[PDB]
């Protein structure tokens, strides 16, 4: 069972830059007779099926542009993407065809862009939900960079760290920004016991936390 290992596990480069990720094989993939290295490279965009980029270690697939270059022989291979665009964000997998199939762990490619402050939006529970015996206060922290952000839920003044479900989106292929959703879910009754709710966000793009509140 030939196992391929890739590195780095992640990369972050700027538009226009050239990048190089690697793929190491536990067993030699170069077939002595045909002289071909049976190693391929594929990529998967967030929410899309994997696409073939290169086979036989360096032959591009039909339609794949010359910006993509595969290299190597034996057990050491490399993929070089030149002119990285905002559209190349995906995970890159190398796969071996020497004996059955085996993909590698993959390498994620993020795009380093300019810092971007989030746009906070707090939302009180809906009538429909309340009538259901529950209360979820949702907060949307959209379009920011970098991904590193801190979001606190404050009820009247005390910090609430239980009942919070957070979730980030993949980096946008459009503007290269992230977005996040934070949700506090208390009971319809506990919700009744408090007045002002706050979503507080701390991100390098500001000196003071960005606060968004609404009193019940």
């Amino acid at each position: 069972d030939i196992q391929l290992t890739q590195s780095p596990s992640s990369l972050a480069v700027s538009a226009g830059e050239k990048v190089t990720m690697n793929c190491k094989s536990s067993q030699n993939l170069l077939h002595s007779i045909t002289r071909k290295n049976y190693l391929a490279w594929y990529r998967q965009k967030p929410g899309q099926s994997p696409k073939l980029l290169i086979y036989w270690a360096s032959t591009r697939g039909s339609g794949v542009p010359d910006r993509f270059t595969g290299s190597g022989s034996g057990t050491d291979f490399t993929l070089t993407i030149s002119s990285v665009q905002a559209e190349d964000l995906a995970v890159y997998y190398c796969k071996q065809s020497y004996n059955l199939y085996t993909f590698g762990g993959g390498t994620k490619l993020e795009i380093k862009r300019a810092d971007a402050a989030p746009t906070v939006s707090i939302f009180p529970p809906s009538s429909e939900q309340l009538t259901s015996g529950g209360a979820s206060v949702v907060c949307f922290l959209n379009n920011f960079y970098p991904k590193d952000i801190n979001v606190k839920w404050k009820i009247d003044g005390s910090e609430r760290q239980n009942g919070v479900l957070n979730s980030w989106t993949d980096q946008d292929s459009k503007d290269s920004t992230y977005s996040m959703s934070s949700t506090l879910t208390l009971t319809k009754d506990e919700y009744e016991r408090h007045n002002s709710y706050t979503c507080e966000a701390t991100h390098k793009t500001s000196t003071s936390p960005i606060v968004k509140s609404f009193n019940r």
Binding site: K51, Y55, T119, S126, Q129, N166, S167, S179, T183
Partner: protein, 211 residues
């Protein structure tokens, strides 16, 4: 154009069995070898099975983890590829892609994929709550199972400005949200609707974000 449509995914209980099917188009199915590759939730790809053409007497190959439990087959007459899964284990949860992959070359075309969930949990319809206050409206979709759900704004008319966050599995139930930033004018002036669909429970709800 080559077209690969996989259907049949779904919620199955452990030790159960399921059968995926694939419809191929835009190429001579009878000549090529076909594969099945799966992607486990929060994982990379894993080759599952392969069946060669009649020219090589339908030779089939299976991964170690799936051997003797799965059965890949094909019907060149209907351009259909199948994957009979038996003695399902929770490990088999993931997306299954139908993949054309000629002998000696590489994996050419992959389908969209079909989700398969192996668990003893029960199908639970989602509860869509409209989140009402450039204005950001939103939509909360919580308490469903299994994955996935389908959110859209105004049946598709609204694509830019939308942000659908990945579902989170809280207390055996998924919760997901979607937000849409539209100009201050088209709302409440123009109608913005949260279209949500949950295949597993044949659900479709259109919640108009009113305020």
């Amino acid at each position: 154009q080559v077209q690969l449509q996989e259907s049949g995914g779904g919620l199955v209980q452990p030790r159960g069995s399921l059968k995926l099917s694939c419809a191929a188009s835009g190429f001579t199915f009878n000549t090529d070898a076909m594969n099945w590759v799966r992607q486990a939730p929060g994982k990379g790809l894993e080759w599952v099975a392969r069946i060669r053409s009649k020219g090589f007497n339908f030779a089939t190959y299976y991964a170690d983890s799936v051997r003797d439990r799965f059965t890949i087959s094909r019907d060149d007459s209907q351009s259909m590829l199948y994957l009979q899964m038996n003695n399902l284990k929770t490990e088999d949860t993931g997306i299954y892609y139908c993949v054309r992959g000629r002998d000696g070359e590489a994996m050419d075309y992959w389908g969209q994929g079909t989700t398969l969930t192996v668990s003893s949990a029960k199908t639970t319809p989602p509860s869509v709550y409209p989140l009402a206050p450039m204005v950001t409206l939103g939509c909360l979709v919580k308490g469903y199972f299994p994955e996935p759900v389908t959110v859209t704004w105004n049946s598709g008319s609204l694509s830019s400005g939308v942000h659908t966050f990945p579902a989170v599995l809280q207390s055996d139930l998924y919760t997901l949200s979607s937000s849409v930033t539209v100009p201050s004018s088209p709302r409440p002036s123009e109608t913005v609707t949260c279209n949500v669909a949950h295949p597993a429970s044949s659900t479709k709800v259109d919640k108009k974000i009113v305020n």
